Amino acid sequence: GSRLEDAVKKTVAENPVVVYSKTWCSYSSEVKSLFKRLNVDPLVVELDELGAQGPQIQKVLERLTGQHTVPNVFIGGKHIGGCTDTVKLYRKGELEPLLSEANAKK
Numbered sequence: 001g002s003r004l005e006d007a008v009k010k011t012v013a014e015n016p017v018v019v020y021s022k023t024w025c026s027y028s029s030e031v032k033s034l035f036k037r038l039n040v041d042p043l044v045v046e047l048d049e050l051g052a053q054g055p056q057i058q059k060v061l062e063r064l065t066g067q068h069t070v071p072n073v074f075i076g077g078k079h080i081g082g083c084t085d086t087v088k089l090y091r092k093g094e095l096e097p098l099l100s101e102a103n104a105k106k
């Protein structure tokens with residue numbers, strides 16, 4: 001449990017943009033599209049493709065972020081929120097500078 005938390009923390013530190021996702025979730029597909037449009041290639045972890053580990057990672061995500069929904073977006077090692085939250089940062093003009101500070105590749 002503490003190792004899983006540690007692994008999540010490393011994941012978000014190793015990658016400019018991380019999206020914890022589920023393949024079927026429209027909001028997740030939507031935030032992935034936004035990143036595609038902004039020429040970012042995030043690390044996408046599909047919780048529904050992880051079997052038993054999926055619910056385990058989500059437990060950790062809820063502890064670290066306060067959020068129980070997907071997508072769970074991180075940029076530059078920092079929790080952003082979900083699709084709607086990410087889109088808010090975009091509309092406000094704050095998203096691209098964050099992606100730059102995170103050195104988002106592509």
Ligand SMILES: *SC[C@H](NC(=O)CC[C@H](N)C(=O)O)C(=O)NCC(=O)O
Nearest residue numbers: 025026027068069070071082083084
């Ligand atoms: S599609 C799966 C569900 N996601 C959302 O409802 C995300 C909405 C947010 N406002 C956003 O990301 O934009 C989901 O995670 N359902 C699980 C549940 O417990 O409701």
